[PDB]
Paper text:
Tau, a naturally soluble protein in cells of the central nervous system, promotes microtubule assembly in healthy individuals. Acetylation, recently identified as a key pathogenic PTM, decreases tau binding to microtubules, increases tau aggregation, decreases tau degradation, and leads to synaptic dysfunction and loss.
In the complex structure, 7 residues of 12-mer tau-acK280, corresponding to tau residues 277–283, were modeled with good refinement statistics. The complex structure revealed that the Y01 epitope recognition site forms at a groove consisting of complementarity-determining region (CDR) residues of VH and VL domains, where the tau-acK280 peptide binds. At the rim of the Y01 groove, the peptide backbones of the 12-mer tau-acK280 are clipped by a network of hydrogen bonds with Y01 residues. At K281 of the tau peptide (tauK281), the main chain nitrogen atom forms a hydrogen bond with the VH Y50 residue of Y01. In addition, the electrostatic surface potential map of the Y01 Fab revealed chemical complementarities between polar tau residues at tauN279, tauK281, and tauD283 and Y01 residues R46 and D27D of the LV domain and R52 of the VH domain, respectively, indicating the residue specificity of Y01 epitope recognition. Overall, the complex structure emphasizes that the side chain atoms of acK280 are deeply plugged into the Y01 antigen binding site. Four aromatic side chains — Y47, Y96, and F97 from the VH domain and Y96 from the LH domain — surround the aliphatic side chain atoms of tauK280, and the VH N35 nitrogen atom forms a hydrogen bond with the acetyl oxygen atom of tauK280. Biolayer interferometry revealed that the dissociation constant (KD) of Y01 for the acetylated tau peptide 12mTau-acK280 was 2.57 × 10–10 M.
Author numbering:
A (entry chain P): 3 to 9
B (entry chain H): 1 to 82, 82A, 82B, 82C, 83 to 210
C (entry chain L): 1 to 27, 27A, 27B, 27C, 27D, 27E, 28 to 212
Amino acid sequence: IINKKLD
Amino acid sequence: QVQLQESGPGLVKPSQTLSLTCTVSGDSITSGYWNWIRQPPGKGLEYIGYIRYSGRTYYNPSLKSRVTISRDTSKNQFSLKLSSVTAADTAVYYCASVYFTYWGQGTLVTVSSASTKGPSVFPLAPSSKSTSGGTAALGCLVKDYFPEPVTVSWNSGALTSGVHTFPAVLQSSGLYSLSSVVTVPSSSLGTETYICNVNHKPSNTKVDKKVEA
Amino acid sequence: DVVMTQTPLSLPVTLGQPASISCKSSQSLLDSDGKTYLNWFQQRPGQSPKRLISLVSKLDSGVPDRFSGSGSGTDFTLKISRVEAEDVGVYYCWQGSHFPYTFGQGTKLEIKRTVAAPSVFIFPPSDEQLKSGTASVVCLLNNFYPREAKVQWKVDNALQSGNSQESVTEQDSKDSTYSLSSTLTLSKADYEKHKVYACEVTHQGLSSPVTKSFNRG
């Protein structure tokens, strides 16, 4: 579950 | 699941460099993102930055001139370097996995020119006046150490339920002090041995104290 | 950076009642990819923060459905339909659509539970500490609610003033109770001058004050 911009 | 644990000196003199290491178990740091984040006393959370699966780093521009994050894939460890510290860098420092799913327990770093000092450990002896029917209280008084924190365990971790370790208080001497107490059955006295184990990492001291009735 | 602000910063909630925390950001968090990276942490007492809500309203794993999240663009709400004891802690909203990631001040959720009286214990100083020249007399108030309590020291019936220090635990995540220590500090010389050391406690959970005392012998 993605909760963040990584780049 | 992924486990993380940070390590490093609890005390850093002003204008010196703080160094911390995070050891990762259960998955390789060649694969994820590895974050540092800090919690100054009573002052929410502050993101520091990360190192990537590939070694690429991102730094909070609030800190980027004094901060380095690096990694040792041989030891499955990544690390934090924050130079020219001031009392503003006093905080709990946490490492965490990608999306902050898994966390270390955090390590308190105190920025101060005062010297470290380990604690004296005195018994809070169970008496007839520390027993309430079936319940007796006993403890350890952990006095005059700097800086925070001390860790107190009981019978090397076998005695977990019933423990209260109170928050430290800063005395006007500039030293901290706290008590750790535990409630046990009054029947266990005389027959069960009770020992408190005090860890003061900043001074590299561990103290074991047998508490007798 | 993008600023996160929470309200209130302190939230006392009766067990079983609902609770609401508002979060507002200084910029929209709706990214062009269609996602809104507003999230919530729960920091239980003595622990690190843990994921609670992701993307405004998706409950993260292991989170009870009593929790809800809402809002769009700049105004956000955390909701607990019925507050339970495990909800004790600090709640942080944070933002992951702009670098650097930024976090709210945190809202401390304190729990109002059943009133319960402390159990009181008293400890004489050990002979060992006396050799250092100082005497610490500890009075312990265990597992009580609310946190307010009056602890007075009496030495041979003399009311003590200005030589005591108290410390209170965070409230328990399972019991929602407090425990308290009160420490009376004397020189060994002054400790040896007197016989009876008494710790006197009043609390809303008590019909009468409770005294614990010892005889220094």
